[PDB]
Predict the structure of Polymerase acidic protein.
Amino acid sequence: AMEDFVRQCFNPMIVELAEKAMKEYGEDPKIETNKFAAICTHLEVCFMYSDFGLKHRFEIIEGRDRIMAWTVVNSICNTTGVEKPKFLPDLYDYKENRFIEIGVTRREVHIYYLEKANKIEKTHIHIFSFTGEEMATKADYTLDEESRARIKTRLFTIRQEMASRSLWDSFRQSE
Ligand SMILES: CCc1ccccc1-c1cc(=O)c(O)c(C(=O)O)[nH]1
Ligand SMILES: [Mn+2]
Ligand SMILES: [Mn+2]
């Protein structure tokens, strides 16, 4: 089952967070399994991305309840002067001095890029596929190659584990 795989392939903190995220908004991870899998996969990227950092470079925003995430965002604007977003993003960059929206997609990276860019407004956008393909505003990929390489391998691995269990098709197609 998709669901089994999620518990079997993600650190509980991430599963627990993804469950909480879904079940609060009234979604069943036992039914909406592929969303469950996707939500986990996103958090993890986000956490990975965050913790590949000026010792501490990134502010993690995804993961937090909405009260916290907006505190962290309101705190950040007051002290740096960068514009407040209309939509909570995934990260802030304390070096390059901008918020980051992380996209993960099982479609072409340029398509999921444009969707993102459409929704927003001075947020750096960085998209990862599961084919180890990326795309980021002004092709500024924000991170040293070794860090970007770990994400791509992870996402690829998650693709390939799904495919062991005949899941990739379900998942690829439900975006
Ligand atoms: C996490 C995947 C997802 C599925 C359905 C609706 C929204 C989202 C989503 C995608 C994102 O990239 C993202 O940053 C968020 C978010 O809540 O911040 N949500
Ligand atoms: Mn987000
Ligand atoms: Mn995101």
In short: The two ends are 19 Å apart (CA to CA).
